[PDB]
Design a protein around this ligand. Sequence first.
Ligand code: HEM
Ligand code: HEM
Lengths: 145, 145
Amino acid sequence: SVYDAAAQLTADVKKDLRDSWKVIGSDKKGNGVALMTTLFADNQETIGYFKRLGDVSQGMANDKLRGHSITLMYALQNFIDQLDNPDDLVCVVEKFAVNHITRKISAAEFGKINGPIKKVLASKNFGDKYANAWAKLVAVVQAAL
Amino acid sequence: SVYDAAAQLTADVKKDLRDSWKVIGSDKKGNGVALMTTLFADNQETIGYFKRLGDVSQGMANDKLRGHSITLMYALQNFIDQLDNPDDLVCVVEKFAVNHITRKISAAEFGKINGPIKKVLASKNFGDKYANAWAKLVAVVQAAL
Ligand code: HEM
Ligand code: HEM
């Protein structure tokens, strides 16, 4: 239930998400590409799903990957902005869930993004506390897959 | 090319885009739904394209339409944020162009959005000068369709 998952976003969790996003969201291009490259490096079995982006090993030099990465960061910006209203958070989460359902991405595979999130957060001096907060947001999307 | 279309957006145009977005973008849910509902009212022939959203006449109450509309506003937020770097604007515009090319939306059909944009801008007292500025940004997307 995406609704029960959304209920897990308590006051403390929402605060950690916002505080960490202020830093991470300030460089969408850089952190977005870092997130994607980390995903591909740590989970090579996921590269097949991104055939449309071409050679993802080119990282920032790949125009399609950069466009994709920047756009992905605005999906997260969207989620953060909807934290105040669960009804709105849910409808945007389901809209994005559809985009992945069509690509045949399961809740389990979507969850593979938690590893990269923790690593990027760590490189910015945000520990486990913050990685767990983000895992709860990711869990809302997983509930819709 | 798309680059030529973007590279042409002048300082005055970007200024008008940013000033109007400060207001329009401060209420993404309200203005996004208003944009979509206006498109369906003035161009009923486009309704068929949005069958995934269910009954679009339900407006705000339709969760799928609400989620689509809010998300649409973040694509625009993305564009506005990339105005000072044509290279980044181009790659995000091309990514979004693919989403519509797959739905068989032509450059001409995409331009139908200019009417609704003009009307919603007018509701917030932003005149022709501003509508012309947005038509120029829409033209950047049309260059990719
Ligand atoms: C923080 C989590 C994630 C976010 C916010 C996110 C966001 C996005 C966005 C905005 C798009 C573009 C949607 C479209 O235009 O159709 C997208 C595409 C895609 N995502 Fe994700 N995603 C996430 C995690 C994942 C994971 C972990 C996988 C797979 C292991 C995945 C697989 C895909 C694929 C295959 C595409 C299509 C790429 C293309 O061909 O353009 N995503 N994602
Ligand atoms: C300011 C102009 C516009 C913006 C920024 C915009 C934005 C978006 C976004 C972000 C999506 C979701 C992409 C995806 O998940 O695959 C979308 C989907 C779509 N757009 Fe647009 N769009 C615009 C104008 C139009 C116009 C004028 C038409 C048609 C006359 C159109 C037809 C569609 C269709 C059919 C979909 C698929 C909806 C669905 O089934 O989920 N768009 N648009």
